[PDB]
Write a protein that binds this ligand. Sequence first.
Ligand code: HEC
Length: 104
Amino acid sequence: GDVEKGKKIFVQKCAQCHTVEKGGKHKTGPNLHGLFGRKTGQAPGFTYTDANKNKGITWKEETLMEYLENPKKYIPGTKMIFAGIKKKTEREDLIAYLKKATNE
Ligand code: HEC
């Protein structure tokens, strides 16, 4: 989608859990510090539930789409609470922002 709207919209409904624009600790969501290429399923501290811990994926521009669209389906019992995104644009916008969140 856009990258800027991704960031804006993200902060509008994601940052509450994922404040990835400062030294925001892993409270209700891990700070998205790399994401693309950064194999999950193994954090140094808050490594989430078993359900996510058990996954071990490289958070590519495939699995992010799957997750953000249908997170409860992608992972059957995460602590993430996000049943739907918007329609389609937001699914592409958020995932475009994070494609630069890996870099900023
Ligand atoms: C709090 C109720 C949440 C909201 C709102 C959002 N997310 Fe989230 N997310 C949440 C938890 C508890 C977890 C842990 C599971 C895990 O796999 O770490 C996550 C995880 C993610 C991840 C992966 C993190 C990683 O492994 O590096 C992504 C990519 C992610 N969440 C993105 C994301 C976005 C863009 C959100 C707004 C649409 C969003 N999350 C909201 C909890 C919560």
